[PDB]
Scaffold this active site. Structure first.
Site, mmCIF file in Angstrom:
data_model
loop_
_atom_site.group_PDB
_atom_site.id
_atom_site.type_symbol
_atom_site.label_atom_id
_atom_site.label_comp_id
_atom_site.label_asym_id
_atom_site.label_seq_id
_atom_site.Cartn_x
_atom_site.Cartn_y
_atom_site.Cartn_z
ATOM 1 N N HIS A 1 0.823 -1.205 0.000
ATOM 2 C CA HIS A 1 0.000 0.000 0.000
ATOM 3 C C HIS A 1 0.858 1.257 0.000
ATOM 4 C CE1 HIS A 1 -2.107 -3.292 2.005
ATOM 5 N NE2 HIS A 1 -3.222 -2.791 1.504
ATOM 6 N N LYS B 1 -1.130 -7.959 -4.325
ATOM 7 C CA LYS B 1 -2.113 -6.887 -4.320
ATOM 8 C C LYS B 1 -1.385 -5.556 -4.230
ATOM 9 C CE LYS B 1 -5.764 -4.724 -1.559
ATOM 10 N NZ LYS B 1 -6.641 -4.820 -0.361
#
Lengths: 218, 216
Positions: B116, B142
């Site tokens: 992230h 991700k």
């Protein structure tokens, strides 16, 4: 401590009259429970409370913390916060905090920044963070959490002393009833009553008035 | 693509019901956002999701990537990763990668290895390395990064194609909104929605958008 009673808009005028006679210092308008949220309807309600000599808390509880979505919630705050003695905004509604602080500050009003947990009394670090964030955003931190034991009540009250300042402490539920009276000794400045109790732990306005006199001579 | 909705512990049951009724495929438990992270409180929430016929993603976000410290983090993965359909661990939490892969693999579950960046969309070599490392550790990589222009969105989506395989791609922010719907054609297997911040899309809207754009 000041005594407040929440009210929706049903039989408002008469309930306000009763709140006055029974000794309420503040009427909390739970706009999230109003069947009408137009700027004028709410404004007149705030003015009617003031007309009776009582102070107001403007609350439009978010759905995540026990309220309901109100389309013009933000507009209501913008227009009415300058007119209410207090405005209660959730700490979780971060996007409105700085904004509501500036509005209330400039208008000479007060901001309550609340946190509610209807399931349990969170760990100490959370209790302290809620209090510290409330002060950081310039408001009176309010913590209302369900006590699942007497230990939870003692803990909420004792841990709150680790973050100095006036605040509002409430242990909801049957276990926490005593916190509604004893909170004052721990710096809680406002207590909330029912106009008979409808839920576990609530205390009727008339009873709290007599208790405040008996224990603190007001 | 599958649709996931992240939830904290607030009004869980009511929120889960809406998620199920609206058409969510997955509920991501953001345990780092919970007030109680005890094994039983979390296990019960995980069971509730399954009881509504939905899949779960067990996430215990590290403070390094927008989460907070969870003292019994390892216990939770050890005890709950074998039960959750997916477990999301940060690539930066290097010390737990091999362990979590072994736990999920042995249990027939999937591991998501995330990255992230709430400030920007990193250089292409970083995007590729994150994808490569995710695959190297046996997970579904991700990447959730802030887009500061539409160029950033196109770039994240196009560079990701250089490292083949299932993945999750999200361009956060207003600019990246389109990535939440179009990521699928670039290989993004799961999109995240709000139940009801800039760039997010409500569950109900995404369920409609998915059927409108994607072939049966």
């Amino acid at each position: 401590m000041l005594i407040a009673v929440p009210l929706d808009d049903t039989n408002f005028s008469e309930n306000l009259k009763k709140a006055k006679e029974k000794g309420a210092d503040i009427v909390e308008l739970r706009v999230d429970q109003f069947s009408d949220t137009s700027l004028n309807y709410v404004k007149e309600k705030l003015e009617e409370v003031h007309s009776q000599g009582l102070k107001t808390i403007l609350t439009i509880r978010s759905p995540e913390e026990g309220g309901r979505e109100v389309k013009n919630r933000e507009e209501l705050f913008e227009e009415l916060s300058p007119l209410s003695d207090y405005t209660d905004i959730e700490l979780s509604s971060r996007g409105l905090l700085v904004k509501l602080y500036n509005i209330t500050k400039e208008a000479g009003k007060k901001l309550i920044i609340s946190y509610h947990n209807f399931e349990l009394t969170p760990p100490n670090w959370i209790i302290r963070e809620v209090l510290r964030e409330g002060y950081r955003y310039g408001g009176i931190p309010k913590i209302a959490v369900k006590a699942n034991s007497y230990e939870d009540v003692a803990r909420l009250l004792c841990i709150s002393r680790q973050v100095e300042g006036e605040k509002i402490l409430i242990s909801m539920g049957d276990y926490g009833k005593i916190s509604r009276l004893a909170g004052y000794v721990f710096g809680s400045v406002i207590t909330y009553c029912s106009l008979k109790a409808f839920a576990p732990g609530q205390i009727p306005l008339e009873e709290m008035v007599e208790l405040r006199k008996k224990f603190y001579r007001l």
